[PDB]
Every structure is written in C-alpha cells, then in structure tokens.
Amino acid sequence: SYYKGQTALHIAIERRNMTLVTLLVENGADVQAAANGDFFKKTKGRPGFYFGELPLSLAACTNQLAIVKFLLQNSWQPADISARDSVGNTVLHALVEVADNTVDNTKFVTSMYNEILILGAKLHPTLKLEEITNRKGLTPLALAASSGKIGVLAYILQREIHEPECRHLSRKFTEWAYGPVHSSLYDLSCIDTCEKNSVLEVIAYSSSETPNRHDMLLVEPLNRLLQDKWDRFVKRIFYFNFFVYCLYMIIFTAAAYYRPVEGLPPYKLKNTVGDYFRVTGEILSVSGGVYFFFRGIQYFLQRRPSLKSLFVDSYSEILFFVQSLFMLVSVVLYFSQRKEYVASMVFSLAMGWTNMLYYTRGFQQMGIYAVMIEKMILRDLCRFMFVYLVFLFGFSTAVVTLIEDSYNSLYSTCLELFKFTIGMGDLEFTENYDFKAVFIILLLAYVILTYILLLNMLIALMGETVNKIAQESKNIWKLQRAITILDTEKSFLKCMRKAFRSGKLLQVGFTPDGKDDYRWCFRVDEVNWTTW
C-alpha cells in the first residue's frame, strides 16, 4: 500500500544520488516495475506527491536529466518511454500535471519535455509518444489545456525545433523572415475538429476553476484561428441568429398583446384575417418553445454539468430553458381550459425580451453589461438577501406583534417595510396605534438600520463588483466569443465541413521513416523589430 513496490532506487533517485541509482540497475534491478499507493496517488485528502508510478517517470519528474538519460540508454534494461501506469498517465502526462504554472517550473518542465522527446525520437522514430491517452482519453496536449497548464500548452502549440534531424517534431514552421515580418506555419493537426477532445473544445468547456482559461486563448495559433473563424462564416450566422430571434420576439409580443379576452380557453378560430394571424402567431410561439426546449435538453445531456457549477457556467442556458419551460406550461394550461395561461405567458415574454442581452456577448463594448448583471445577481444579491431577511422578518414580527390591538397584516407590514428599505416609505405616524413611542422607535431604528446602513452596504459591494469586472473587459469578451464560435461550428456539421477550419493541407517535411507527411497548416505573421 504505502510502500507498494517502493525500493531504495526511488530514495536514491529522490536523494539525487548519481551512483546509487546507477548501482541498483547495474546489479540487475528492473525499473519496469512501478510503485502505487495512497501516498503516490493524486489525492488531495491526504498528503502526497504524484510523480508517476514508473521509476523513469519518478526520475524525470524529480529534475534529473542525466539519470533518466542513463536509464533510457541503459544496456541492462532501458526504461520504456511508452509505459503507462494503472491510471494511464505515461511519462509525458506526468510531466504535464507536475507543472505548477511558474516561470521557473514551466521553463524547466518544457526544457526536459523537449529533451526526453528528442531522445525518444532518436531511439524510436517509428512511434510517436504524444498520441497516447490516459484513462480519461485525453493527450498530454489536451491534459495541459484542460488543467490550466498554460506554460506547457504554450510550449507544445508553438514548438519549433531547428535541428535538421528533428523537424517532424516541430509544430510551428517559420516560412521566411524578410524583416520585422516573419511568416509562420502552425500545425493545427489536433487543435480543431480533431477528436472527442481538442485544445479549443477543452478550453472553451472548462469549469471556470481553471485559472488561465481567460489568458489561455491569448496563445498565438488559437487567437488567430478564432478570429479567422469569426471573420469567415461565424459572424453572419450569428447575425442571422440574432435577427431571427428578434423577429420571433416581435411575433411573440404581438400575439401576446392581442390575446382574446372573452370566454375560456381554447378559443374557436374565428373566420377573419386577424384571427388567422393570431393563430399563426401562437403556433410560431409554441414552435419556438419546443425548439428551445430540445436545445436545452440536448445541451444538458451533452455537458451534464455538476450541480454546483450549473449556475456559474450555464446562466444563459438555464434562462433559455426556463423561458421555454414557461411557454410549455402555458400551452399545457391553455389546452387544459384554464384562464391561468397568461400568468405564465407574461413571465415567458419578459424573460424572452430581457434575454437579448445574451446576444450582447457578440460585441466588445456591450458585453460587460450582460456579464455584470450575471455576477451581481449570483454573488452579491443572493447572499445579501439572507442578511436582509432576518432584519425584515424580525422587525416585522416585532411591529405586527406590538400593534396587533398598512400595518394590519404581516404581509402589509412586510410590504411597507420593504418600501422603507428602498426609500419609498412614508413615516406618517398618524393613526393612534397603541404604544406610539415604541412604534416610532422601532421604525426609526428600522430606517436607519436598513435604508442607510444596509442599502449602502450593498451598493458599495456591487460597486466593487462592477469595478472589478469592468477593468478587464477584453478578457471577459474573448472567452464569450470563443464559446459562441464553438457552438455555432458544432450546430451544423456541414458548416464545419465547408468552413475549411485549417488554412491549408500541405506537406512541409519528411518523416524519419522516409514517407512524406501531409498535415494541415495555418499561416500567420507577426512584427518584432526591437530584436533586430
């Protein structure tokens, strides 16, 4: 368990013993065996340090390049670079998650990743180690993108190896550099429409726990590719979507405005042009409701978000589903011959109109208003209502008990005191209630305590929120645009098929096996003349 498979070789390697590690294998010790235990597993419940189960993985993750090089080229028993532990994470996976997103650690991990990759390619040109996935079925590139390891992701995406013998390893190819301009070609082999997981598809669908997701899209190839997609075909599809929803809202509003008021539902289709238009409008509304209902259900089946992160990352999807739900309930109650379809219909309609703030995500300047309204309703208001309701209920039970002998019912006390909270009350003190002085003291205390202290406390807190999420507007907008682009691309398969996501499909190098390799590419350019 704790020491399962653990040998003195592990201690010597972890103690940076150059000779002892050599002596263990020289005697005949086999490194192919691995040690697994609660201490070695990646469990936050108890202390531990996951360096991988393979002894080669341990040596690599422990910053010992000479020792790992010796093990790989060891005559007695070379370590298998392709070995996978019980979890599935091979050496490259282990190096990926061992990163901690610091300049020193990221530089070290990337450098040693390069060294091990070059050495393995020299040993085994036939096999490529970056295509092997773990139990979760995601490659080291996908692992780095998903876990927020921005350093490793930035390394792998734009990995350029100048060495003539190691060219197929390079990801980015520099076509030419006339001057400050330097044309470059990126591989894009597994960045878009690659498999059930891809760097873009994984960054977009993070849980918001990832720290660098906002700054993850800044990496050159991804930003260029997203901008190209937006400018190519996504933009007009988004504008067509916004236009059709604007028309649907206009028809929904008109058919809701002119609802017949005589009799009980259903209503016999009167023989007129106006009646025909009204029934057509109702049908259009309900069809939109079914469309949004199925869209929401299929989204919830695909993603299957956790309950805690159902509102942090799926606010808009929840709101569209709720609007569809209210219309569906309204039509059910209209087929059930009740007058209560309108009460649900107004909810559905006001939701429908205030939901065009979803499409403000498509502009750079107008996005923040749709983002603020979200955080300010989930962080501040939600938890401040607990603090406010103890005040309201305590003081209202107090007030109604005092003068049980405007303030007649507990409901009316609640309403009058809420208007006191939001500055719409009137301290009349006119009718001769019993214990008038105590009544005055209670309500003056209430005004000072809630109207002045609490309301301005909330206002300052929301101002801090606005200040916080208004400074970094570009980051806030870019991720919303990324998710929009991904969803538009996924909605229509032929859209992606004819979009030609990659810039080109060209063969730019020759593999060590001697067979020409054809790969996708996406030319980019940049300007930097301060380096001469």
Ligand X SMILES: C=C(C)[C@]12C[C@@H](C)[C@@]34O[C@](Cc5ccccc5)(O[C@@H]1[C@@H]3C=C(COC(=O)Cc1ccc(O)c(OC)c1)C[C@]1(O)C(=O)C(C)=C[C@@H]41)O2
Ligand Y SMILES: CCCCCCCC/C=C\CCCCCCCC(=O)O[C@H](COC(=O)CCCCCCCCCCCCCCC)COP(=O)(O)OCCN
When asked if residue 322 is in the footprint of ligand X (CB under 6 A), the reply is: yes
Residue 323 in marked binding region: no
Smallest distance from its own copies to CB 508, Å: 6
The first and second tokens of residue 495, run together, are 């859209």
For its own copies, give the closer residue by CB, 442 or 495: 442
Number of Cβ atoms within 10 Å of the Cβ of 152: 26
When asked if residue 376 is in the footprint of its own copies (CB under 8 A), the reply is: yes
What, of ligand LBN, ligand Y, ligand PCW, none, does residue 414 touch, CB below 5 to 8 Å by kind? Answer: ligand Y
Q: How many residues of this chain bind its own copies (CB under 8 A)?
A: 134
The residue from 377, 440, 493, 505 that contacts ligand X (CB under 6 A) is 377
Cα 353 off chain centre by:
26
CA distance 257 to 307: 37
Residue 14 in marked binding region: yes
The angle at the Cα of 277, spanning 271 to 282, to the nearest 5 degrees, equals 110
Is the C-alpha dihedral spanning 424, 428, 431, 434 positive or negative? positive
When asked if residue 402 is in the footprint of ligand LBN (CB under 6 A), the reply is: no
Task: With CA atoms as reference, report the closest residue to 462 among 365, 382, 387.
Answer: 382
Collapse the DSSP code of 263 into the 3-class scheme (helix H, G, I; strand E, B; otherwise coil) and give the result.
Answer: coil
CA distance 63 to 65: 6
- Footprint (CB under 6 A) of ligand LBN, residues 209-268: 247, 250-251, 254-255, 257-258
For ligand Y, give the closer residue by CB, 133 or 421: 421
Smallest distance from ligand PCW to CB 353, Å: 12
- Footprint (CB under 8 A) of its own copies, residues 100-159: 104, 121, 125-126
For ligand LBN, give the closer residue by CB, 2 or 257: 257
When asked if residue 453 is in the footprint of ligand PCW (CB under 6 A), the reply is: no
Kindly give the residue spans of alpha helices, DSSP state H, lying in 28-179: 55-61, 65-72, 91-98, 103-123, 140-146, 150-157
Pairing verdict, β 172-176 and 504-510: unpaired
When asked if residue 247 is in the footprint of ligand PCW (CB under 6 A), the reply is: yes
CA distance 319 to 358: 10
- Footprint (CB under 6 A) of ligand X, residues 439-498: 445, 448-449
- Footprint (CB under 6 A) of ligand X, residues 299-318: 315-316, 318
Residue 75 in marked binding region: no
When asked if residue 127 is in the footprint of ligand PCW (CB under 6 A), the reply is: no
Task: With CA atoms as reference, report the closest residue to 522 among 263, 89, 221.
Answer: 221
Smallest distance from ligand Y to CB 350, Å: 12
Task: With CA atoms as reference, report the closest residue to 168 among 507, 509, 504.
Answer: 509
CA distance 225 to 336: 52
- Footprint (CB under 6 A) of ligand LBN, residues 277-296: 277-278, 280-281
When asked if residue 382 is in the footprint of ligand Y (CB under 6 A), the reply is: no
What, of ligand PCW, ligand X, its own copies, none, does residue 513 touch, CB below 5 to 8 Å by kind? Answer: its own copies
Residue 85 in marked binding region: no
Smallest distance from ligand PCW to CB 378, Å: 18
The first and second tokens of residue 525, run together, are 């350019």
In order of 248, 330, 364, the CA distances from 370 in angstroms are 21, 28, 11
Q: Which residues of the shown chain bind ligand PCW in the complex (CB under 6 A)?
A: 241, 244-245, 247-248, 251, 284, 287-288, 291, 295, 316-317, 320
